[PDB]
Paper text:
The ‘TELSAM’ variant of the human translocation ETS leukaemia (TEL) protein sterile alpha motif (SAM) domain is a 75-amino-acid (9 kDa) polymer-forming crystallization chaperone that is soluble at pH > 8. However, when the pH decreases below 7, TELSAM forms a six-subunit-per-turn helical polymer that can enable fused target proteins to co-crystallize. TELSAM reduces the entropic cost of crystal nucleation and growth by pre-freezing some degrees of freedom in the crystal lattice. Additionally, pre-ordering many thousands of copies of the target protein along the polymer results in substantial avidity to strengthen the subsequent target protein–target protein interactions that are formed when adjacent TELSAM polymers associate.
The batch 2 crystals that diffracted X-rays were obtained in 100 mM sodium acetate pH 4.6, 2.0 M sodium formate. One of these crystals diffracted to 3.3 Å resolution. Taken together, these data suggest that the vWa domains in this crystal may adopt at least six different orientations (one in chain A, at least two in chain B and at least three in chain C). An alternative possibility is that interaction with the PGM drug molecule may have partially misfolded the chain B and C vWa domains or disordered their positions in the crystal. In this scenario, the chain B vWa domain may still be partially resolved because it interacts with two copies of chain A vWa domains from two distinct 32-axis polymers. However, no clear sign of PGM was detected in the electron density. We were able to refine this model to only relatively poor R work and R free values of 0.28 and 0.31, respectively, which diminishes confidence in the space-group assignment and molecular-replacement solution. The interface of the chain A vWa domain with the chain B vWa domain buries 99 Å2 of solvent-accessible surface area and is more polar. Specifically, the side and main chains of Leu219 and Asp220 of the chain A vWa domain make hydrophobic and van der Waals interactions with Arg139, Gly140 and Ser143 of the chain B vWa domain. Nevertheless, the multiple observed binding modes in this crystal establish that the vWa domain can stably adopt multiple binding modes and that doing so does not abolish useful X-ray diffraction.
Residue numbers in the entry: 1 to 238, 242 to 250
Write the structure that this text describes.
């Protein structure tokens, strides 16, 4: 249901290392007030920990083990529902008064993904890219980020490449194992200069990092432009909140 899985362990246990298994034993010892667990109990990586039976956890950890085994089974279920969302919001002068629709789309979509493993990140761009909310799962920090999204004044030009770059850097910091990273862009496709060339180039970098690029058209949007940023035409939509919740 709800596991207080910290950083460096948010990834799937199959992608863990030997130091991550030790960090998992140190976290579980204080989270569940377990007996002093020796660090040399599970001298193996994450892939080898998934092959052991529950009787092996009892042998290596007589006091716990059964708790460490069942906790690993719940963490595997948390990783299946784990997902990283990135909201790329266009705060340029092109959206103007339509920024209320961008805020309502993010607010209504944030009220649905209430899972503890669901982490959100707010990145607005408009002649400058600034990550308002870093990637976190704390609902209090997300509610703080939502209020700051309303504090945004639509001023600047459209430069999606700089906004998608900050999203890919967070995906790069999470790594390719965080394939559940999803980028949700809320723009109007009103690009100028070589930005159409850099927006499609930066989008391919997101695809190389194992991320899905979803585009949300606001007011008027060049469909041919957003289909090149997104993976396909199906991932482009102006209902739409349910479509984002389904995929
Ligand atoms: Mg603009």
């Amino acid at each position: 249901g709800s596991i207080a899985l910290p950083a460096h362990l948010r990834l799937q246990p199959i992608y863990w290392s030997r130091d991550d298994v030790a960090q998992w034993l140190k976290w579980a010892e204080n989270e569940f007030s377990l007996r002093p667990i020796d660090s040399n109990t599970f001298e193996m990586n994450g892939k080898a920990l998934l092959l052991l039976t529950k009787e092996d956890f009892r042998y290596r950890s007589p006091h716990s083990g059964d708790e460490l085994y069942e906790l690993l089974q719940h963490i595997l279920a948390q990783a299946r529902a784990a997902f990283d969302l990135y909201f790329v919001l266009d705060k340029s002068g092109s959206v103007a008064n339509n920024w209320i629709e961008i805020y309502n789309f993010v607010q209504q979509l944030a009220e649905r993904f209430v899972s503890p493993e669901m982490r959100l990140s707010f990145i607005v761009f408009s002649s400058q890219a600034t990550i308002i909310l870093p990637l976190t799962g704390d609902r209090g920090k997300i509610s703080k980020g939502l209020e700051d999204l309303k504090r945004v004044s639509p001023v600047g030009e459209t430069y999606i490449h700089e906004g998608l770059k900050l999203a890919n850097e967070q995906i790069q910091k999470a790594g390719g194992l965080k394939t559940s990273s999803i980028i949700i862009a809320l723009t109007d496709g009103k690009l100028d200069g070589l930005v159409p060339s850099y927006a499609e180039k930066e989008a391919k970098i997101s695809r190389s990092l194992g991320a899905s690029v979803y585009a949300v058209g606001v007011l008027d949007f060049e469909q041919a432009q957003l289909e090149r940023i997104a993976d396909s035409k199906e991932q482009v939509f102006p209902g739409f909140q349910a479509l984002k919740g389904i995929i």
